[PDB]
Swiss-Prot record:
Belongs to the mulikevirus repressor c protein family. Changing residue 285 to N: Almost no effect on both the DNA cleavage and joining activities without bloing tetramer assembly. Responsible for viral genome integration into the host chromosome. During integration of the incoming virus, DDE-recombinase A cleaves both viral DNA ends and the resulting 3'-OH perform a nucleophilic attack of the host DNA. The 5' flanking DNA attached to the ends of the viral genome (flaps) are resected by the DDE-recombinase A endonuclease activity, with the help of host chaperone ClpX. The gaps created in the host chromosome by the viral genome insertion are repaired by the host primary machinery for double-strand break repair. Induction: Expressed in the early phase of the viral replicative cycle. Expression of early genes is repressed by viral Repc (latency) and favored by viral Ner protein. Mg(2+) binds at residues 12, 79, 135. Changing residue 135 to Q: Complete loss of both the DNA cleavage and joining activities without bloing tetramer assembly. The catalytic domain contains two distinct activities, the cleavage and strand transfer activity and the flaps endonuclease activity. The N-terminal HTH Mu-type domain 1-alpha is responsible for sequence-specific DNA binding to the IAS. Two adjacent regions 1-beta and 1-gamma bind to the ends of the viral genome. Contains a D-x(n)-D-x(35)-E motif, named for the conserved glutamic acid and aspartic acid residues and the invariant 35 amino acid spacing between the second and third acidic residues. These residues coordinate the metal ions required for nucleophile activation. Each acidic residue of the D,D(35)E motif is independently essential for the 3'-processing and strand transfer activities. This is DDE-recombinase A.
Length: 295
């Protein structure tokens, strides 16, 4: 069969060999999850964190569908043949962000998005080939040249440290630029690129020949993490004591609709990266109420 851009995406992980001082002050080795388009080899999204966990899988996917939309025939692969995604397929401590996070099921969420999940290197019934490229350079490993071995992180690079540790902000900027350069690099030796184009070129060309649908706000919000219900004061404000892997803070959120309505408790959906600005409030039974701004 024929393969469209975005029709089949591969999820892969990467344990970085660089010591980084994270937002909470701890010096750790970051782990990043990447979603890659199988046809063009373009990296479409990622999330990096202190450890391997489902949160990164779930949130990087959200980034991909928000940015490119959802194709009508969508295949997703997380090759756990040799148990390589095992640590990633594990919900972290329920209090990894200090405040407690509600236990839910991401698997259910993907299937609802209209994604056919696969746990092997191939898609049954289609002669599309394999998820991971045979050429290490066309996959996630090819990024070590642009990231882990970038001159700027050389002091913190350990290879396959409180004084050497580089800042989380510098590492994350370097990661984002390495991904950009990996995609834009021309002269790619693949069928689509013919030794001339970059992954970006072929992706832009083929993506324009694909039929995708944009995700609704609700869909996008269902991929956000659910925190255990917090109380709302009479003023329509509630608090989240942020911490764990994130920089400690006692965040207070607000929205008029919260007081001028009926609720005492509310379930908060959030993106760890946006905790500082906007979260989404839901009733204990799941009805969306409104979004709240960090005061």
């Amino acid at each position: 069969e024929h393969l469209d851009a975005m029709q089949w995406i591969n999820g892969d992980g990467y344990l970085h060999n660089v010591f980084v001082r994270w937002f909470n002050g701890d010096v750790i080795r970051p782990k990043t999850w990447f979603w890659q388009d199988v046809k063009t080899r373009k990296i479409l999204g990622w999330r990096c964190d202190v450890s391997e966990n489902i949160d990164s899988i779930r949130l990087s996917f959200m980034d991909v569908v928000t940015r490119y939309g959802i194709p009508e025939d969508f295949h997703i692969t997380i090759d756990n043949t040799r148990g390589a995604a095992n640590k990633w397929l594990t919900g972290g401590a329920p209090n990894r962000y200090r405040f407690k996070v509600k236990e839910d099921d991401p698997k259910g969420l993907f299937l609802l998005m209209g994604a056919k999940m696969h746990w092997t290197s191939v898609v049954a019934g289609k002669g599309w080939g394999q998820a991971k490229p045979v050429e290490r350079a066309f996959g996630v490993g090819g990024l070590e040249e642009y990231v882990d071995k970038h001159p700027a992180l050389a002091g913190a690079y350990t290879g396959p440290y409180g004084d050497r540790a580089v800042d989380a902000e510098l590492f994350l900027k370097t990661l984002a630029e390495g991904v950009a350069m990996f995609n834009a690099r021309t002269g790619r030796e693949t069928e689509m690129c013919g030794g001339k184009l970059s992954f970006d070129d072929v992706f832009e060309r083929e993506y324009a020949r694909t039929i995708v649908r944009k995700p609704t706000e609700e869909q996008k919000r269902m991929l956000l993490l659910p925190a255990e219900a917090v109380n709302v004061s009479r003023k329509g404000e509630f608090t989240l004591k942020v911490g764990g892997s994130l920089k400690g803070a006692k965040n207070v959120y607000y929205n008029m609709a919260l007081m001028n309505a009926g609720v005492k408790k509310v379930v908060v959906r959030f993106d760890p990266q946006q905790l500082h600005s906007t979260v989404y409030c839901y009733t204990l039974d799941g009805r969306f109420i409104c979004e709240a701004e960090c005061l």
